[PDB]
Amino acid sequence: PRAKTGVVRRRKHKKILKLAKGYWGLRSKSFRKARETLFAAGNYAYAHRKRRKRDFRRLWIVRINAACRQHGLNYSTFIHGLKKAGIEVDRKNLADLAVREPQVFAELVERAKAAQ
């Protein structure tokens, strides 16, 4: 029996093109350019999931640094103090406290100065 392509290739090309919706020019219209665009897209997504974790830690740290310097110490001193005090609140929540709960953060700062 003969088994011609028939339906199969069109359906595969459609899967790819649907994923490429939104892409510029031929990157969303041509199967070939869509597929190339997607290769890169997937690698970026993987790399940037990893990178997103670093991106946010850097942001927290910057905010934490600014909140600390309002109370007369820098970030690196503040983190040492927290360590000596045994306080384990992470940078994500430190940064939140620094903005949403300035009294609590100021309290944390005291403990950190004292612990040293």
Binding site: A41, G42, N43, A45, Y46, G86, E88, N93, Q103, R111
Partner: protein, 101 residues
Amino acid sequence: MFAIVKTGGKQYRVEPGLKLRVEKLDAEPGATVELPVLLLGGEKTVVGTPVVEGASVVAEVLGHGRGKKILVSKFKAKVQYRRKKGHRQPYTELLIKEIRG
């Protein structure tokens, strides 16, 4: 009153009435669980070293789910290497009931 709790290797600021998604807990839907407390705030401030001895947050597990599928896709040029993996992160959904100081 808010508490900073620790579950699934991560920390969250919770309050009564908060619905929260966390890493999957080994606990039946409808059960209630108690989360370790790192810090208390709002009216009174108490600071854990690292956790506060007395306190706990009571949470009702609303249920477990699977996250929206993420396409983890790998490609190496000029080497015919392509990998396509579908990933759905399991989670437990919690309803924060009370902060027991």
